Each structure stands twice: as C-alpha cells, then as structure tokens.
Amino acid sequence: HWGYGKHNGPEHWHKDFPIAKGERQSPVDIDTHTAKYDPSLKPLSVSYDQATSLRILNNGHAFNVEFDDSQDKAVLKGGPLDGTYRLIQFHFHWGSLDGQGSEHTVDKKKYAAELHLVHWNTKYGDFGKAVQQPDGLAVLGIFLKVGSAKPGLQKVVDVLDSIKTKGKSADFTNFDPRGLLPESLDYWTYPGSLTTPPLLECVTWIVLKEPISVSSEQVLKFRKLNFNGEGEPEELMVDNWRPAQPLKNRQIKASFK
Ligand SMILES: [Zn+2]
C-alpha cells in the first residue's frame, strides 16, 4: 500500500522498506559543478534497432511499456558498464504542474517529467535475479521539458485512454524507443537504487544531460491517468516522483567537460 499520497508517500516508505534510508538511494541532485569529468568513461552504446515492444500496463504507480527481453534485442552497453544490459521496460515520472515531476534534479532544477529506460545485466539471467546484485540494472534517465511536441511519444500518449486505471494493459507492438532519445548521449553516472519500493540498491544510473521536449498537450494526457482501479474513487496519477535523496559517500561522474 505504498504510493505518492499524504499518507503513503516517499516519507513513509522506510517503514516497510528500511533500505529507503540506505547508502546508495536514488534519485539525487546532480550538482554540475561538483560532478567530475572522467575522461576514461566510454561513449554509451544504445542498440535499440531490434527492439520488440509488447504491451503497455498501468501498474497503479506509473505506466510501463514492456519489451521482449528473452534475447539481446534492445541493449545498453558501454559507458560505465561492463557487459550487456537488456531493455525490459520504460516508464515515466511526472508532475501535476510543469515545474515539477522529475526525480533527479540538476543544480536543484526540476523538470516536468523523467523517462526511465530500465535494463538488466544479462550475466544474471533474469530481472528478478539482477535486482539482487549491486551491478544488476542500468537505468537510462532522460529529462522532459514542456515545449515542442515529441512526435516519437505520440503513440504512447494515444493509447493512455485504454489504460486509464490500475491493472489495465493494452497491446503495444512495434514501438521504437529510439524516438525518445535526445541528440546527445552525454551523461552523468553514479551508483544508486530503484526509485520505487523495493528501493533495491542495484542500479547504475546513466542520466542524460540533454532533455527532450514534449508538448503541454502530451504531458496533460499523462495527468489524466488514474492511480486507482476501475470502479474505485478517481485519483489522478500525478506527482509520482520520489524527491532527491542524500548523496552520502558517492561521486557523480560526467562523460563530458
Ligand atoms: Zn522510474
């Protein structure tokens, strides 16, 4: 029964998930001045040409676009990563207003939303095993600002009416996640966690410097989703973001000067 309400939101999670107060929690504020350029970081390799999207699901906290991860079809390699990480799903976090919604912040700036492309390390065989390992996941985080529309997002926006409430799913084949990537793959990276319960400390975060732009109409459609099930009282799915957590004994590295 965790969520984003007054009574069950991020400040309460630690009671069921004590790792909430752990040493490598996410998100964090990215202080651009203090991040260190690491000239030995490699370019990211994003290989999404063979991606197979399957379905979109409202899970009561966000919506997930799920992929076939039973073969190396859509993978992330390079950068800070050793080995091959398969895309399993992406989802967003967003606000009730354009001035909030992201999980990571940049010099304390909040974006309207944040996209998370979630990948797991193939050496661990499946996602459930990967989340038990300190190098199990790689999450590509991309900020959204409101401005021009993102054409490559529109297919997602259009299906949202069919998954308004918790537990609803819809077929979602042939969606190309390359259409959600900014021009530049410059990034920050640090070791962290899932940003929802169970908050496991299994993620290498790769946060892109360059935001993508989406339109006010597109983000409005996100805000018409519901946290609740059909036939339950309507609560808009907004402000499904965890705030910045203490950096503790971590250094954020930059791939760029
Ligand atoms: Zn997320």
Short mmCIF file of all heavy atoms in Angstrom, two decimals, residues 91 93 103 116 195, ligand 1:
data_model
loop_
_atom_site.label_atom_id
_atom_site.label_comp_id
_atom_site.label_asym_id
_atom_site.label_seq_id
_atom_site.Cartn_x
_atom_site.Cartn_y
_atom_site.Cartn_z
N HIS A 91 9.29 3.65 -18.35
CA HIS A 91 8.19 4.35 -17.72
C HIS A 91 8.61 5.77 -17.43
O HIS A 91 9.79 6.11 -17.64
CB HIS A 91 7.77 3.65 -16.42
CG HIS A 91 8.87 3.60 -15.41
ND1 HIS A 91 9.82 2.63 -15.38
CD2 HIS A 91 9.22 4.50 -14.48
CE1 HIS A 91 10.72 2.93 -14.45
NE2 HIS A 91 10.38 4.08 -13.88
N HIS A 93 8.04 9.37 -14.71
CA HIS A 93 7.58 10.03 -13.53
C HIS A 93 7.22 11.48 -13.95
O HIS A 93 7.97 12.06 -14.74
CB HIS A 93 8.67 10.05 -12.43
CG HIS A 93 9.19 8.71 -12.10
ND1 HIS A 93 8.69 7.94 -11.08
CD2 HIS A 93 10.09 7.92 -12.72
CE1 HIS A 93 9.31 6.78 -11.06
NE2 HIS A 93 10.16 6.73 -12.05
N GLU A 103 12.64 13.17 -11.00
CA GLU A 103 13.21 12.55 -9.79
C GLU A 103 14.60 13.09 -9.53
O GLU A 103 14.88 13.74 -8.52
CB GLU A 103 13.14 11.05 -9.93
CG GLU A 103 11.70 10.54 -9.99
CD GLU A 103 11.57 9.12 -9.55
OE1 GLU A 103 12.31 8.26 -10.04
OE2 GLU A 103 10.68 8.89 -8.68
N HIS A 116 12.56 6.74 -17.60
CA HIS A 116 13.46 5.73 -17.13
C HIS A 116 13.39 4.53 -18.08
O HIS A 116 12.34 3.85 -18.11
CB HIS A 116 13.13 5.27 -15.71
CG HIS A 116 13.44 6.31 -14.72
ND1 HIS A 116 12.89 6.37 -13.44
CD2 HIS A 116 14.23 7.43 -14.84
CE1 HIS A 116 13.38 7.42 -12.82
NE2 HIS A 116 14.20 8.08 -13.64
N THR A 195 13.87 3.74 -7.68
CA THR A 195 13.27 4.87 -7.03
C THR A 195 11.88 4.59 -6.50
O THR A 195 11.24 5.49 -5.94
CB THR A 195 13.27 6.11 -7.89
OG1 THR A 195 12.31 5.93 -8.94
CG2 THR A 195 14.64 6.47 -8.44
ZN ZN B 1 11.47 5.18 -12.58
#
